[PDB]
Amino acid sequence: MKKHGILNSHLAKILADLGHTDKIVIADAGLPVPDGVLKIDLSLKPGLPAFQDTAAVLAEEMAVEKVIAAAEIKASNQENAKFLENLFSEQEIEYLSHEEFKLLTKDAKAVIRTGEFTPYANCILQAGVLF
Amino acid sequence: MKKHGILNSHLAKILADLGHTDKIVIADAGLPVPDGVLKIDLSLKPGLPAFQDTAAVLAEEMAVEKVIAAAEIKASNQENAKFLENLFSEQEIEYLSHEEFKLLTKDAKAVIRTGEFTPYANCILQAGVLF
Amino acid sequence: MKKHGILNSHLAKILADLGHTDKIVIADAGLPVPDGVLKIDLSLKPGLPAFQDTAAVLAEEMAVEKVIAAAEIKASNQENAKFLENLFSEQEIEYLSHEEFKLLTKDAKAVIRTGEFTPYANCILQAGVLF
Amino acid sequence: MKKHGILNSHLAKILADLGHTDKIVIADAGLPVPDGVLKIDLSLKPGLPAFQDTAAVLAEEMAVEKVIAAAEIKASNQENAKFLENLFSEQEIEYLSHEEFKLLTKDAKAVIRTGEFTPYANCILQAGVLF
Amino acid sequence: MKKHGILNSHLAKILADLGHTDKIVIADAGLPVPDGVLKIDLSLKPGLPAFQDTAAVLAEEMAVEKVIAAAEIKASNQENAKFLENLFSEQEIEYLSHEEFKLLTKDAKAVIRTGEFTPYANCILQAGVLF
Amino acid sequence: MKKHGILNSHLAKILADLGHTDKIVIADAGLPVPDGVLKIDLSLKPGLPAFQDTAAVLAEEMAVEKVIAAAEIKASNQENAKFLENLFSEQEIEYLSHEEFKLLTKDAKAVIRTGEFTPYANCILQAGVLF
Amino acid sequence: MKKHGILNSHLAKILADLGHTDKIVIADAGLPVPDGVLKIDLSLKPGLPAFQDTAAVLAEEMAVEKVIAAAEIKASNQENAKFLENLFSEQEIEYLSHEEFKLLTKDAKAVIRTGEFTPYANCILQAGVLF
Amino acid sequence: MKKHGILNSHLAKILADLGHTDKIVIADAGLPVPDGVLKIDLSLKPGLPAFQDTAAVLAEEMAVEKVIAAAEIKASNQENAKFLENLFSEQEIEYLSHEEFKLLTKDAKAVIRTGEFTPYANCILQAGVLF
Amino acid sequence: MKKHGILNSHLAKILADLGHTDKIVIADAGLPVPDGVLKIDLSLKPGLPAFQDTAAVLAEEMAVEKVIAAAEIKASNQENAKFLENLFSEQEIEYLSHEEFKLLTKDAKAVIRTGEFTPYANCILQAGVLF
Amino acid sequence: MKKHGILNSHLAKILADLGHTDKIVIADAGLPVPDGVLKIDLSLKPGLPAFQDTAAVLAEEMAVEKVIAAAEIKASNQENAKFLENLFSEQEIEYLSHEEFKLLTKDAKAVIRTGEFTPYANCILQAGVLF
Ligand SMILES: O[C@@H]1[C@H](O)[C@H](O)CO[C@H]1O
Ligand SMILES: O[C@@H]1[C@H](O)[C@H](O)CO[C@H]1O
Ligand SMILES: O[C@@H]1[C@H](O)[C@H](O)CO[C@H]1O
Ligand SMILES: O[C@@H]1[C@H](O)[C@H](O)CO[C@H]1O
Ligand SMILES: O[C@@H]1[C@H](O)[C@H](O)CO[C@H]1O
Ligand SMILES: O[C@@H]1[C@H](O)[C@H](O)CO[C@H]1O
Ligand SMILES: O[C@@H]1[C@H](O)[C@H](O)CO[C@H]1O
Ligand SMILES: O[C@@H]1[C@H](O)[C@H](O)CO[C@H]1O
Ligand SMILES: O[C@@H]1[C@H](O)[C@H](O)CO[C@H]1O
Ligand SMILES: O[C@@H]1[C@H](O)[C@H](O)CO[C@H]1O
Ligand SMILES: [Cl-]
Ligand SMILES: [Cl-]
Ligand SMILES: [Cl-]
Ligand SMILES: [Cl-]
């Protein structure tokens, strides 16, 4: 067995190919996935796994230089919005309209679907560099 | 969005094709997957999701006529062994040696990998019929 | 066997991947299917299954926020036009010319072909969200 | 549009390649489909389409020289057992145990899944020749 | 064996998927086939099969709404040109320059190559509707 | 255009790869095709193209060292049986039961389906060598 | 074995699909091949096979109506330039700059790589028609 | 970028899928790779990378329960044989003849080719379990 | 461009993957190629390229450990037989019956077709090791 | 085994297809790889293989007519910037902004990932010609 890194086999393969500026998406159960973008569905049931649990694991296994989210999250999901601001305190966090956000997901290497059943609980993690 | 059934998109597709006697495997993080058998990895980190949570969701979404498990589970994982006996009280539960168990997984339609980090926490669910 | 959700295996797989705003098409026996769009043909013979039977089952298994149809349906197929109004009384219904309608089918995740042999008996169901 | 023959596009493609002795299977909603065998699911809901309706359409679009069903159908599904005898008057009807029946389906060019929710409502149609 | 419809298996598959306005092309031995368009070659030797024989069969198995040919056919192949006018008396026959004709072939579902060794013996059949 | 050789593009490709002892099959409209063997269907309608016309073209474009046919052809299809004897007078002709003939088609590089509607009008052409 | 036509199996397949105006390229060892264009490499070692030998065989097996070559060939490779003029005296020969020549290879059905080690020893053969 | 685990992207994907008892092979530049086994070639030039460098990195990123090597390594490659003994001092090391060794490579998930130019410098690492 | 090694791109790819004991076949124009074995056809016309020319090039670019040919070559092709003996003076040359020779070709990584039009001008080159 | 040329099997296949002006990229561990471009990862651990070592091997196995690097390398990576100037003395070295550089990589036939952990250690080698 693999000794280090993320436990999920599908996710390990995606992280392995990440280069500077590549993007991956963490999404709630309702975000549509653009045609041609790989979808890894980790959901089991509503709320499992949660957006917070998934984002935390990725933050620990991936070098993130920037986080992108939809402005709407501040209005309909303060709970998760705060979590995001706290988790990525050192990184740059940009808010765009949800419409623009969706547009940006077309360039993602993958969309990770969580079981999160709350509004606009989605974010784009942009890969940094280790040197 | 889909109104009923299992939330996970990968799993929904597998359940959709199940016919009487078809088998699927729920497995801990260490079970090897036979070549040619589809692998759906739901693990996020050790213990998430747990064997119990995964087995419970499947029991509710799939008609199971028989459950197969390795005798070794009774010796090294009484906790999960009891859970299994309780969850599938109405179904037939058969214990085989772990070696035989692995052999049977070659005929499964899929292996669902959980984040369970305890010994022999694996079982084979054999599909029943609705009429 | 799968206990909940739509009975058709091909359809279950499509519903499983629907995200907010994704579209699927229910078509009569004559609608052309754009290249690149998956076609699931349920027809057996003229009139079986009917547009009404198909649309009703889908309404029960999918959360629809908007319905789109060709304006020509009102004048050439009153029975079915009324059926739609009644079935999706709570959703927004939009009428476009058949020409524009056909153009929209290019973005659909799938086209479900029925055995319907009456004019303009087609519609686009746009997925809503569960939270 | 195609003027003659069966309406279903998927089925038309299967019938087109049929040669003397090739086999296709008409199945109820529970029959498991062997790996590698093409599956065409026409089901919409329990009981639609019915085994009888599907078998009737195939009978008039395909030259059948022999029908094969499971003996169990005579005891558990007398109504559909009679339908077959009546529908395939001139053809040779052979009965086998359900187990042997399933073995034969591995050689089928395709399995057509109906919405039939009654025990052992399955049969294999063996293609005849037109000269 | 298949009881009704066109005898050729490849062609039956093409006709089965035809929807209103879909196009197929019947070509002589020299017409180039655009990249991406399926080619079904029925030629055996020069003159076999003939343009006329192939067109006659398709006219009988397909609902033709409109026929398109190159104006050059009237100048260099009056024999086949007259044939076309008579075979499709009831349908609309449009003449375009051979150059425009070729551009339209790129939208066809298939090109059927015949053994015809006479100039401009090509035509596009546009599918109609059965209701 | 290609100046020499067989006119049919599909067949030209198969002949191009023939080595000493490779086999191709010419079949009537009813011969079943083993799974995995390429099928090139040249049929248009019953009797077109005929078994005789197809065999004659192949004989002229391929170096045949041996011909294999079913014994049943001599009694059930005298006309074609005589034709085969005349066309391949130089080569060795071997007659096997039809059942044994069919097993042999498993090793063929391709089965050419003709429009022939007369019994046992099939034969295997075994490639010879040009030096 | 195939009695007539070009000996190379790869090339025989390309010639079989040629229609009026289709193009194939004969190249020296250095010509780059555009992505998506089939490359058939016949080279063995420098000078084997030569540009001249390859062009001569193709000229005898393909109906060429036009030849296109880079203007630079006349000054940098006089020997081959003369050869091209002699071999294709009947057909139309057009000279374009090498850069423009390369853009043209994008539309070729295939690039045949020879062992030629002399500059600008490339040419495009445009298919003619046999009637 | 991925923060933890093995640096090589191809290798990370292989490690991610390892289950208990799965095998991977580290090979010198001359070992033949069985058909069907994925080959990841890390060689740059003779001696780079070395067997020792490769084996050491893998030992750090993978939980190995058993090592298998060819007995011939002890006599023909003492330096490397000793290196293995030392590196995997805590694991079980099994020596088979090179012939039997090669047979075992057929079951490997992958063969990692190094730039090692010394005799029998190959080994099979058998994955252990983390709990 | 590639500076060193064999000039042919297809062949370079085959040589690159060769491991100790791997086999490639050099064949005359009539040798049949087993299903599943890659065929690289270098033939242009009869006699070009010659068996001798092709074998000479491979001998120079590949480390040959053993050579296998059919005994029949000594009887019907003494010229090429002597060539082989001289070219591979240092290597082991084994003669088997042509029938056994053919069975061994099924294990080859590739068959290289030459333009050789003389009997039994075929041979299997078994790869050696560079250390 | 292959006697001459680069040792890496993956790289050998890429070099084999190189034509005049084709490009390959040598990258550090952080460079993102455009979609559709082949990625060959040689990295083993940070610093192995090094940018210099990889570039040196490619230089002697590939005819390079022009090198392209990012201007940023001169300021952030002076050591590797000098290496390049020194290694490619005769070749033309062009510098562009890192952004323009990345755009050019979309046209590369492949990206070779090294274990180089230093800023802007990337370069594009443009293939020259051998005559
Ligand atoms: O689920 C997503 C969003 O988070 C929001 O709920 C709107 O619909 C989808 O786009
Ligand atoms: O992880 C599984 C078992 O559950 C046990 O831990 C032994 O190794 C694997 O087969
Ligand atoms: O069948 C469809 C329509 O419903 C109408 O019948 C016109 O032709 C097709 O576009
Ligand atoms: O559904 C089929 C049978 O008809 C019976 O119900 C038993 O299970 C399946 O094999
Ligand atoms: O064969 C076709 C035409 O019918 C005409 O002969 C001109 O060349 C091809 O385009
Ligand atoms: O069509 C073939 C035979 O020629 C015969 O007609 C019997 O059925 C098929 O096997
Ligand atoms: O090899 C070709 C040309 O013939 C010329 O040598 C220049 O480089 C390539 O484009
Ligand atoms: O390279 C391998 C071995 O390590 C040994 O060198 C013999 O040849 C191959 O099998
Ligand atoms: O061409 C080959 C042989 O070399 C011999 O000519 C016999 O036929 C084929 O098997
Ligand atoms: O790794 C590369 C560069 O060399 C630099 O480190 C910036 O990120 C990537 O583009
Ligand atoms: Cl990892
Ligand atoms: Cl479902
Ligand atoms: Cl039909
Ligand atoms: Cl090489």
PDB file of C-alpha atoms in Angstrom, chain J residues 79-129:
ATOM      1  CA  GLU J  79      23.313  28.394 -13.346  1.00  0.00           C
ATOM      2  CA  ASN J  80      20.954  26.473 -15.639  1.00  0.00           C
ATOM      3  CA  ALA J  81      20.736  29.516 -17.907  1.00  0.00           C
ATOM      4  CA  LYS J  82      24.487  29.271 -18.534  1.00  0.00           C
ATOM      5  CA  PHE J  83      24.332  25.509 -18.988  1.00  0.00           C
ATOM      6  CA  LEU J  84      21.937  26.022 -21.907  1.00  0.00           C
ATOM      7  CA  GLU J  85      24.043  28.732 -23.560  1.00  0.00           C
ATOM      8  CA  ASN J  86      27.099  26.485 -23.231  1.00  0.00           C
ATOM      9  CA  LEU J  87      25.375  23.263 -24.306  1.00  0.00           C
ATOM     10  CA  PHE J  88      23.690  24.801 -27.346  1.00  0.00           C
ATOM     11  CA  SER J  89      26.570  26.938 -28.627  1.00  0.00           C
ATOM     12  CA  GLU J  90      25.817  26.557 -32.341  1.00  0.00           C
ATOM     13  CA  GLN J  91      22.033  26.526 -32.016  1.00  0.00           C
ATOM     14  CA  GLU J  92      19.877  29.644 -31.930  1.00  0.00           C
ATOM     15  CA  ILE J  93      18.624  30.402 -28.419  1.00  0.00           C
ATOM     16  CA  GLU J  94      15.438  32.455 -28.188  1.00  0.00           C
ATOM     17  CA  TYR J  95      13.978  33.871 -24.964  1.00  0.00           C
ATOM     18  CA  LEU J  96      10.332  34.692 -24.331  1.00  0.00           C
ATOM     19  CA  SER J  97       8.261  35.602 -21.303  1.00  0.00           C
ATOM     20  CA  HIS J  98       7.174  32.569 -19.288  1.00  0.00           C
ATOM     21  CA  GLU J  99       3.587  33.208 -20.398  1.00  0.00           C
ATOM     22  CA  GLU J 100       4.397  33.073 -24.108  1.00  0.00           C
ATOM     23  CA  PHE J 101       6.563  30.031 -23.382  1.00  0.00           C
ATOM     24  CA  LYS J 102       3.618  28.112 -21.917  1.00  0.00           C
ATOM     25  CA  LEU J 103       1.527  28.942 -24.987  1.00  0.00           C
ATOM     26  CA  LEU J 104       4.157  27.364 -27.231  1.00  0.00           C
ATOM     27  CA  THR J 105       4.130  24.117 -25.245  1.00  0.00           C
ATOM     28  CA  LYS J 106       0.623  23.419 -26.559  1.00  0.00           C
ATOM     29  CA  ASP J 107       2.298  22.570 -29.883  1.00  0.00           C
ATOM     30  CA  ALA J 108       4.906  20.233 -28.393  1.00  0.00           C
ATOM     31  CA  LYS J 109       4.869  16.550 -29.324  1.00  0.00           C
ATOM     32  CA  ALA J 110       5.639  15.786 -25.695  1.00  0.00           C
ATOM     33  CA  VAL J 111       6.694  17.210 -22.359  1.00  0.00           C
ATOM     34  CA  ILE J 112       9.475  15.453 -20.485  1.00  0.00           C
ATOM     35  CA  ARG J 113       9.156  16.015 -16.753  1.00  0.00           C
ATOM     36  CA  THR J 114      12.414  15.947 -14.790  1.00  0.00           C
ATOM     37  CA  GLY J 115      12.916  16.067 -11.030  1.00  0.00           C
ATOM     38  CA  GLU J 116      14.310  19.596 -11.266  1.00  0.00           C
ATOM     39  CA  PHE J 117      13.161  21.746  -8.343  1.00  0.00           C
ATOM     40  CA  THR J 118      14.525  25.112  -9.501  1.00  0.00           C
ATOM     41  CA  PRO J 119      12.650  28.106 -11.046  1.00  0.00           C
ATOM     42  CA  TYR J 120      12.065  28.212 -14.806  1.00  0.00           C
ATOM     43  CA  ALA J 121      14.237  25.206 -15.604  1.00  0.00           C
ATOM     44  CA  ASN J 122      12.287  24.494 -18.812  1.00  0.00           C
ATOM     45  CA  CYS J 123      13.141  24.609 -22.502  1.00  0.00           C
ATOM     46  CA  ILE J 124      11.742  23.692 -25.894  1.00  0.00           C
ATOM     47  CA  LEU J 125      14.007  21.911 -28.368  1.00  0.00           C
ATOM     48  CA  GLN J 126      13.080  22.474 -32.004  1.00  0.00           C
ATOM     49  CA  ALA J 127      14.070  19.602 -34.292  1.00  0.00           C
ATOM     50  CA  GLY J 128      16.501  20.277 -37.104  1.00  0.00           C
ATOM     51  CA  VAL J 129      17.156  18.170 -40.195  1.00  0.00           C
TER      52      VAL J 129
END
